[PDB]
């Protein structure tokens, strides 16, 4: 009958792992909690609010490199931040779908101001710092979203033979599956950082 | 009572725009088609197969730069391909969620072999060509997925004031919204291409 933040978020993350993001509804959560829906409303007004709370919790638990570390290079900060963000998105079933569209709350503002102060002090324009961080965020989401979906689709589709593909495509696809999700993420992340370096050197 | 590819895919893309990807089911489609479900089964065995057909159709209609164009530079090919892919993902409601996890069929193999032949003839290793294309694909998906979700979330959440944010975050967020989806996509795409150039120059 009684709720608080921690009770509602712990039950919701277990439900997310049991049923996935489409399966998750405020009604199913109230039931798992053994509470009536109007008690739950004061804590999560709707699905959207629930998703946002769950995305923030996953970052609070697993996003260890949210903020720059003294005395990291900007390149190491961007790589570590992306890796940490990725770990948060992979922490739960459909975690990156949970994260899409999330807004910062006031408790992240200090962190997010420090990221920008740090990059601009490294020589980035404000605009270039914003889009370096945006590009890292969009590439990391895309990466995890595509990974997480192939995983789901395999219960649902005939598993494809590569035998009949033409030679370069066969070799590329077999190599992409062989090396797996983390090497593809690290290769793209490195290409982004190299591009940021090139653009920064110009500018100044 | 009668089906063929075009009838089923046209009705399904209109239903996608009416109800979005979660709203789309094979049963609701059979109803819109005025057909019984076993007739539909021979054309789409389940949701997964339906999604895959819809993702391929959106590329067949809107992905104009699927293949390299003679005599494009590799940088122009990668930029144009990404822009064309983006247009396909934006063509319908939830289009990028439709595209997640899609597998090529045999009719794309020629196209996809030509992309790789083209990049390796430009001096890429097979591995580096594969992950340049992967990184462009993941960044573009991420970009569109995040855009498409903020759009949805606005019917569902109090629209946030930036007034109380600290000065760099306030300026960055206001600038990201001001310039909009396409400039953020183009900035990330350009950073990727610059990074590819840097890595290619090394190598050889």
């Amino acid at each position: 009958s009684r709720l608080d933040k921690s009770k509602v978020i712990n039950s919701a993350l277990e439900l997310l792992n049991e049923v996935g993001i489409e399966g998750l509804t405020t009604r199913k959560l109230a039931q798992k909690l053994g509470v009536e829906q109007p008690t739950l409303y004061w804590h999560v007004k709707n699905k959207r609010a629930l998703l946002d709370a769950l995305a923030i919790e996953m970052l609070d638990r697993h996003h260890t490199h949210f903020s720059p570390l003294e005395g990291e290079s900007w390149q190491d900060f961007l790589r570590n931040n992306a890796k940490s963000f990725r770990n948060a998105l992979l922490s739960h079933r459909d975690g990156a779908k949970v994260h899409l569209g999330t807004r910062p709350t006031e408790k992240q503002y200090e962190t997010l101001e420090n990221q920008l102060a740090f990059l601009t002090q490294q020589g980035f324009s404000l605009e270039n710092a914003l889009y370096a961080l945006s590009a890292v965020g969009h590439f990391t989401l895309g990466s995890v979203l595509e990974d997480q979906e192939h995983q789901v689709a395999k219960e649902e589709r005939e598993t494809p033979t590569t035998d009949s593909m033409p030679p370069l495509l066969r070799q590329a696809i077999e190599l992409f599956d062989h090396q797996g999700a983390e090497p593809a993420f690290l290769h793209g992340l490195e290409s982004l950082i190299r591009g940021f370096e090139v653009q920064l050197t110009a500018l100044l | 009572s009668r089906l063929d590819k075009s009838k089923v895919i046209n009705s399904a893309l209109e239903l996608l725009n009416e109800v979005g990807i979660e709203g789309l089911t094979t049963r609701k489609l059979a109803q819109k088609l005025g057909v019984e479900q076993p007739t539909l089964y021979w054309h789409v065995k389940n949701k997964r197969a339906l999604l895959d057909a819809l993702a391929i159709e959106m590329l067949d209609r809107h992905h104009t730069h699927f293949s390299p164009l003679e005599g494009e530079s590799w940088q122009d090919f990668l930029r144009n391909n990404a822009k064309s892919f983006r247009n396909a993902l934006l063509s319908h409601r939830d289009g990028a969620k439709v595209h997640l996890g899609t597998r090529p069929t045999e009719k794309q193999y020629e196209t996809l072999e030509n992309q790789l032949a083209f990049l390796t003839q430009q001096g890429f290793s097979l591995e580096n060509a594969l992950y340049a294309l992967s990184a462009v694909g993941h960044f573009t998906l991420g970009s569109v997925l995040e855009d498409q979700e903020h759009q949805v979330a606005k019917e569902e959440r109090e629209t946030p004031t930036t007034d109380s944010m600290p000065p760099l975050l306030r300026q960055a967020i206001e600038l990201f919204d001001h310039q909009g989806a396409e400039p953020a996509f183009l900035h990330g795409l350009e950073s990727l291409i610059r990074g590819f150039e840097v890595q290619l120059t090394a190598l050889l």
Partner: peptide
């Protein structure tokens, strides 16, 4: 409030 935005970058 004076200013609102309708699109945000990913949070991380």
């Amino acid at each position: 409030s004076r200013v609102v935005v309708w699109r945000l970058p990913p949070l991380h």
